[PDB]
């Protein structure tokens, strides 16, 4: 049985926003039909409550969930179970889907990637599909649902002639498109990092490579639950979703399949990049140790024999071999050049 | 039947037999005084702080009608937390923890609970625990503990243990903060040793916290007749607290693993730098050693007299070859 969680050092019933963004708050509603649409932006929640019992589909979008009062009021007026609200306010979560007899609750993730600082930031977006309302919950201004807004505003496509199910499909489709553009950004970043890794192998290069590794692991742990959500969307059809609009969900599922495969290929490529880095650094170390060993090989035996002739037994044939010393230097040079020739034979 | 642990120093048996009207306590070391408490209708709490003294634990085992196998379970220390259900009593194995801020060393102590009808029994290996708030609540009639049965006493004990786990998590949180700051900027061999030790501590903590979640889940989900149905939400709360602790442990594990990965990422550069240093120092000294050795040879025909003053020219060529090698090392950025 579903139940609100008790948390230590926190009053029993309180709901907490588990996030970092508290800058801004906004409520945006588009009530659209076949004939006419209306849209407005507001802060009052009473201005948007009465749409619960409305005929034409409406899209209530709430930006800024640090306002837990607004989330609680909306959930109470719309009859949302408190655990679903607690899931909404929790952002340390994976994408999920939950089916209820009156509404369906979906958790998705949005990603903005920056070339500078190579930072992959996630924003959680929640969708509640009700009788004729799709509830949009976000943390901060800036989303990817502008195409759906434009289609609603200029009667493009077929969205104006359908119900809220098509609106849910459209929002999820736009989010998957953002996933595609993020994957393209990852292409660009991999290209830059692979160009730099071959000729400039340093510590910041491998810091960037491991950052990319962690980013891709997070992307995989995000895409797999998304694929499960879409699979449950089209192949366990709830009463809220019509018999139509299921092919569209299947298309979104196919797109998720493609995204997952691309993520796996990215992981393989980045592993190859790390191997390339290690090979390059090892080759430089080989070069330096090669010069060290050539010097040591040429000089240590020669220093040894210089020490042999630098000692004193008082009964040694030290002279009279055509002064001997020129012969000693001749032997020095002969063995030195033989060692040089051997190194050339080894191509060092 | 042997105490497998290390703490075999101190012994004392505390008793807190309590009821709404009044409460009675006595700290005694004689076995016979703590026996007849199973017949008391009022809830009773017996605390045996000596485990190496196997005589007393065996005596209370055959006096309370508890199987010798669970007696061996108390006498065994290297054992993850577990719960067992018997028709007459319930057997629970738990662990306490002590963390030293200075030494970064985490040590564990086992506490074993045998809850029978209207009586709870502990078993500790050492003096010192965290059940003191439960004792104070039993004494000065603070909460609802004195007005309820022994299963509520078990709940209070487990709640105190989970609270101690929260405090330990606070200490580990401070340690991870400082260690992450030190590793990110200005790392050191001591910092790597600290990182390894903290990773080991977190591994132990995860391995001892997951069975605790399992135990609390089995406690509230399917309730044996020993636990009343009214006390289920309390054990449920403790289960939620254990969930919180395990989530924090997992997050800390991820942070520490990333800290290790970033450090080990850059070892080959260290190899290359040590190679460069050694090669520079060896290359600019072996030829000089050679020429000094040749001119130190004990032959008799060495023009070591006059000849442009002798040592000035050899010092000059040593300096010239040294600076030439230095210039050659200036290329390629050595």
């Amino acid at each position, epitope marked *: 049985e579903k139940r609100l969680s008790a948390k230590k*050092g926190l*009053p029993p019933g309180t709901l907490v926003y588990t996030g970092k963004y508290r800058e801004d708050f906004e409520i945006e509603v588009m009530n659209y039909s076949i004939e006419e649409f209306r849209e407005f932006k507001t802060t009052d929640v009473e201005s948007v409550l009465p749409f619960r019992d409305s005929s034409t589909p409406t899209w209530i979008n709430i930006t800024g969930i*640090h306002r837990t009062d607004v989330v609680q009021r909306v959930g109470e007026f719309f009859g949302i179970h408190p655990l679903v609200l607690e899931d909404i306010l929790n952002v340390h979560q994976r994408p999920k889907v939950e089916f209820f007899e009156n509404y369906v609750f979906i958790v998705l993730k949005m990603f903005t990637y920056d070339k500078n600082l190579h930072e992959l930031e996630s924003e959680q977006v929640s969708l509640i599909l009700t009788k004729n309302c799709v509830l949009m919950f976000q943390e901060k201004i800036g989303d990817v649902f502008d195409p759906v807004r434009e289609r609603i505003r200029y009667n493009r496509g077929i969205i104006r002639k359908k119900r809220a199910d098509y609106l849910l499909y459209s929002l999820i489709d736009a989010l998957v498109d953002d996933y595609f553009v993020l994957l393209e950004k990852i292409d660009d970043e991999i290209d830059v990092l692979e160009e730099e890794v071959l000729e400039r192998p340093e510590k910041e290069t491998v810091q960037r490579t491991h950052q990319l590794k962690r980013n891709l692991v997070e992307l995989r742990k995000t895409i797999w639950p998304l694929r499960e959500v879409l699979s449950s969307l089209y192949r366990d059809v709830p009463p809220l979703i019509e018999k139509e609009t299921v092919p569209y969900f299947r298309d979104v599922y196919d797109h998720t399949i493609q995204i997952a495969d691309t993520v796996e290929t990215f992981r393989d490529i980045v592993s190859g990049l790390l191997d390339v880095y290690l090979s390059s650094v090892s080759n430089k170390t080989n070069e330096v140790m090669k010069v060290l060993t050539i010097i040591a090989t040429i000089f240590m035996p020669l220093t040894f024999i210089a020490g042999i002739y630098g000692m004193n037994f008082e009964y040694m044939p030290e002279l009279r071999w055509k002064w001997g010393y020129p012969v000693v230097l001749a032997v020095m040079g002969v063995i030195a050049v033989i060692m040089v020739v051997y190194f050339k034979k080894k191509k060092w | 039947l042997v105490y497998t642990g290390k703490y075999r120093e101190d012994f004392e048996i505390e008793v807190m037999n309590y009821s709404i009207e009044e409460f009675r306590e006595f700290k005694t070391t004689d076995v016979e005084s703590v026996l007849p408490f199973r017949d008391s209708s009022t809830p009773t709490w017996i605390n045996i702080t000596g485990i190496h003294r196997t005589d007393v634990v065996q005596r209370v085992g055959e006096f309370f009608g508890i199987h010798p196998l669970v007696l061996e379970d108390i006498l065994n220390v290297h054992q993850r937390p577990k719960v067992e259900f018997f028709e007459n009593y319930v057997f629970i194995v738990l662990k306490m923890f002590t963390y030293d801020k200075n030494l970064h060393e985490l040590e564990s102590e086992q506490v074993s609970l045998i809850l029978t009808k209207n009586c709870v029994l502990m078993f500790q290996e050492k003096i010192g625990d965290v059940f003191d708030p439960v004792r104070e609540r039993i004494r000065y009639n603070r909460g609802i503990i004195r007005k309820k049965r022994a299963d509520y006493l078990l709940y209070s004990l487990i709640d105190a243990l989970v609270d101690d786990y929260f405090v330990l998590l*606070e200490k580990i949180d401070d340690e991870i903060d400082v260690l992450e700051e030190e590793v990110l900027e200005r790392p050191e061999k001591e910092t790597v040793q600290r990182t390894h030790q903290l990773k080991r501590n977190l591994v132990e903590l995860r391995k001892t916290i997951w069975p605790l979640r399992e135990v609390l889940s089995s406690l509230y989900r399917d309730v044996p007749p020993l636990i009343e149905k009214e006390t289920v939400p309390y054990f449920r709360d403790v289960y939620d607290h254990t969930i919180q602790i395990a989530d924090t442990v997992e997050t800390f594990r991820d942070i520490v693993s990333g800290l290790l990965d970033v450090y080990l990422s850059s070892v080959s550069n260290k190899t290359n730098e040590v190679m460069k240093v050694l090669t520079i120092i060896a290359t600019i000294f072996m030829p000089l050693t050679f020429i000094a050795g040749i001119y130190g040879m004990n032959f008799e025909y060495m023009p070591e007299l006059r000849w442009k003053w002798g040592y000035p020219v050899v010092l000059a060529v040593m300096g010239v070859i040294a600076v030439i090698m230095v210039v050659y090392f200036k290329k390629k950025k050595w």
Partner: antibody
Amino acid sequence: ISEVQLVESGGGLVQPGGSLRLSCAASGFNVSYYSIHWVRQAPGKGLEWVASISSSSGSTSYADSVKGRFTISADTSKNTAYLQMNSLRAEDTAVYYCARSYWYYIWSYSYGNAMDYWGQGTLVTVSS
Amino acid sequence: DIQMTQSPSSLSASVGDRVTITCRASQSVSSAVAWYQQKPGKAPKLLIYSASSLYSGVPSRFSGSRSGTDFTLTISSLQPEDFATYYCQQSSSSLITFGQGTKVEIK
């Protein structure tokens, strides 16, 4: 609708050992969704936290300096939090602020609260 | 009761300087530390929460960080309006406490 405002009322000169009650009217927000705090600042001294109420759950917390001597409570219908001060001492003389806070998140086990909106504060004088 | 020890208590600096206020806890306070500023005759104003996060509407010159049980508030570049008393606060326990204050004076 409207800005978030906190207004205190009830500050007055009370004889030592007596009693008085302070009101905290909440505007711009619902007292249930938030936690109301009382903060005491003695003349010439720093801030001291004195009380706390979580109206929706009814949970209360008191400082040891006033524990067993103060009582904090709220009316959800009136959108007002209260502070019943009795058995006052000479050291209770201070300006009493009313504040609103939210809970935020650090780790799974750790939480913290920060105070956003403060009232003007009313002065209580225990003397003569 | 966790004690917050805030030092210095009588800092003085000129406009455009750099102010550092350090604050220490008697025991572990897991990054649940906030900073407030109070001009004389007024109510406190929130500056930093979670020891690092900057409150909305607070000027960007204010900054905070945590080093274990040690917390610091920095005014990177002083302003004429940046002269007031600053306080600590721990909120890891149900019993929450303040620091004793730190007055930044005009030099």
